Amino acid sequence: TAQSKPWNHYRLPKTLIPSSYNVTLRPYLTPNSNLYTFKGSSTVRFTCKESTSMIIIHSKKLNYTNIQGQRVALRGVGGSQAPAIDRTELVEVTEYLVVHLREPLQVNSQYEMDSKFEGELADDLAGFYRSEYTENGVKKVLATTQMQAADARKSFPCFDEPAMKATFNITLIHPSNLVALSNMLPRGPSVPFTEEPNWNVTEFETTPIMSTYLLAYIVSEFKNVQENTPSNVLIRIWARPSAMDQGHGNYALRVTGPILDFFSRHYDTPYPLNKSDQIALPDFNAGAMENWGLVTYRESALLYDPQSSSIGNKERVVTVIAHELAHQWFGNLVTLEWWNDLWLNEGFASYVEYLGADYAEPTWNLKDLIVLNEVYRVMAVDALASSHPLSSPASEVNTPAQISEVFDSISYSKGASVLRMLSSFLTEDLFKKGVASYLHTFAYQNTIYLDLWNHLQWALGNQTAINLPYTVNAIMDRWILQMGFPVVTVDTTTGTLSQKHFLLDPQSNVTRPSKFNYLWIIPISSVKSGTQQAHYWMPDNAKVQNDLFKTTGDEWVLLNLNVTGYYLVNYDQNNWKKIHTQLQTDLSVIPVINRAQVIHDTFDLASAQIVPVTLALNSTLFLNQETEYMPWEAALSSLSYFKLMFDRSEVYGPMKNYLRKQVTPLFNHFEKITQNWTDHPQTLTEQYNEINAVSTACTYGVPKCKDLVSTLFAEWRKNPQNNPIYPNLRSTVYCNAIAQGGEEEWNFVWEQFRNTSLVNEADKLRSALACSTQVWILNRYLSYTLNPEFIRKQDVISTLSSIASNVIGQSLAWDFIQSNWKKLFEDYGTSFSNLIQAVTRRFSTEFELQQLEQFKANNMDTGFGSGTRALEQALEKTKANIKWVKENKEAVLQWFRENSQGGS
């Protein structure tokens, strides 16, 4: 049947396995009279494993210059006589080039296939593509390559399946004015192209065995900062000439060396290649790609300006460098057979990125923010009936579109969360030994997740100290083959633990089936009244008992120490109180990561109606004695919804006075350590809580905070060119200054916004202009949006959603979006979903729901475009918001009023 035909199946036939490729590409970076275009020529050598009469290879958007009769030519290595090509056909859907042969190929015989082709160097961010940038008014264009998944076939005919690894000989014909880069260093110095002497020919060294998706070739006029490591590896940081002249990519050079060294010792495997080129591209939506030896990055993730960039950027560059460098071993040396297992590659790197970044910047304690940035991030989505298992059968991922769906928060963050739990029971040193065992045994090869488990189990067998009650395969099967995470409820009177699938909706329709009936094997580290207890292993059973969790009197138990595991913990009311009294009597006894747990967990349990909302708010009482970031951020994140629903309500006064009483101590703490806000801290966590202290103390009415904003802004208005405000506190001071002032302040920030070149500062000033308390100023600012000479097209959605955040601007913006819907949909519907989510985020009344419903009917003919799901989603959120307010408004008001004096 036609359906049976091998060319109509997405997955490649395993009759031909490739050996090596010879790919020669010529990027034409000058527009054609009609399109930027690239010309190529490839020669692949393959071995027949099973006799077939047809060569099926991947080809996407490639026009072919016919060699002799057909598109390709076939030759034979050894005595192999190549069969004649009867006909060549191109299937577009499955992206294939089917070469029908007159006589079948021979088993275990090698053949070579030549091809000459041409394609479009379009701005598609896929394959050999062009990245356009404007430098000093001159529009310059560079040729770069994103080959992830399907895109490599777009540039050269290849077997684009990660399991079909091969060695590649990349040759580049580029203009002599521009530089040529690839995965490997050039074989020799560039030699001019004989046929056209305005071009050079860079032929690179042969690539190690590697997957087609990790290939890269970039032709650009970029510049570099070099550095040879003690391990004899060349580290080059490439970027636009302007950025390198300003020394923006020097932090990247300062950390790349130490990071590669750490991973070399951690994995016990020397860096496979000798070069680590890291390029920063102007427009890189992907953020970063782990191309081997040519890691492409977005300018915001490799470059750091120490005079304008906040510490948030210093964290992004050091951690993203640690992630794409971890892939050079785990993901590039030992790749994975298919994308059904993409979670292991991205999850492992998303965990070891914090390890490598801690080596580079050890003062920051980054290994503790994985709970906040990765675990807590993914739990919000894994606690829904719409989530998905980490691992799916390989047969389920076939379509290029199905391959892209594997790239999500579950695979990256929950993957890391599950692999951090492994490195907890397995003891890390054993975990390192197994990973090393895996990278040494399966080097230059492809693997199954079982292949890692096997090596990590063998590591335990070569040991007698750590003994696990179950196999590594089974323990992890519960976390990778089923969705969601468990909530452990411990009745301390009887010592009975219970597990249940945690879903944030009180009423939820989990329809997805599980082989383990939504019961997990949970590693349970516990503490009894400050002293660590023995480790526990709760089975895949709903309820069990153990005297480890049986308290008497003032004895309190706290589980998931340091949040190593991927589960929520609930105790009996009495034990919660004993934990809350300890957080008041003395908090140091409870670790910082567990002090955030008692906040995140309680609020998440309250959303599911497992515990009352009063218990969640109770967890925010020890914060008048807290100077740490994680416990404070966990509260400010959870109390954001409270503010969104109550900022325009009767109960905001009590809320503001409570959070003022609780933030006043924190503000005074930083005021002291910073000598009246002069000498700022040097640890990422502390610098972050300083922003939280300043911003929170201000939006809740701390007198001194208003004086600090006024002073800093006053000094800035004088001497405008030199800015006194610290890069980190600039955004808060700017927003506050605009809200505290009027037209003169707004007109200043607007003039500076229209004069600033740095997108970093422009966005800070633009988002600050939306904080105005004047109605007429906000409406004028809203009319500035309609004109693209005042606000860029891409800045419009973030400008509108910022005005909507102002309590005064919510009404003004909703009105503006309804009245200008057609124009906004015709431009952003083709991003817009997020606008209809930023606005309609506070919607909490039946009257607002009616307005949303009436608007849907009115603008049905125009249509909601990309946010059609979002307009429906906003209705469902508003309805869910109306329910929460009705059932929690009175309790929240009473609690805030009662605890208005802060905590003891």
């Binding site: 005079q307 910073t674 000598q675 009246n676 806000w677 002069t678 000498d679 700022h680 004086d707 600090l708 002073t711 800093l712 006053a714 000094e715 030199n722 006194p724 405000i725 610290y726 890069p727």
Partner: protein
């Protein structure tokens, strides 16, 4: 090199002043003391003369958040170095007065420091200690100082 001579020791104390978040004058620890050069070393200067004179040269500079002192002090920030007595039985003024000592060495390093003077910045509003100047002294009459 004659013991019987007058050696003038010029303590150049470059002063670093940073403006506070509430506009207050804040004195940075990054302010630097430059002792006269001796034995190819600015860290320590030992008096090798019967008569000595210790004089203070003070320069005020201003930094912003950067901690790079690129400009001159203006308004509240401006200040002048004042070497407070600190942990010593003698004031910086007493030394240039009729005071006799067998050996007198001013060092920026606390190694061998028999005593330590506290260098401060005196803004119209307040005087804030910045760095400390260590002194190693031996009681005697071989060396004395005066204006």
């Amino acid at each position: 090199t004659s013991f019987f001579a007058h050696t003038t020791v010029n303590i150049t104390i470059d002063l670093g002043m940073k403006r506070s978040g509430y506009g207050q004058p804040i004195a940075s620890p990054l302010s630097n003391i430059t002792l006269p050069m001796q034995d190819n070393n600015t860290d320590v200067y030992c008096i090798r003369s019967n008569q000595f004179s210790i004089y203070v040269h003070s320069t005020c500079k201003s930094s912003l958040w950067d901690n790079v002192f690129n400009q001159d002090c203006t308004d509240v920030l401006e200040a002048t170095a004042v070497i407070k007595t600190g942990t010593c039985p003698f004031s910086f003024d007493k030394l240039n007065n009729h005071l006799t000592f067998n050996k007198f060495c001013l060092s920026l390093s606390p190694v061998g420091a028999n005593c330590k003077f506290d260098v401060a910045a005196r803004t119209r509003t307040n005087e804030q200690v910045v760095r400390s100047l260590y002194v190693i002294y031996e009681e005697g009459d071989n060396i004395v100082g005066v204006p």
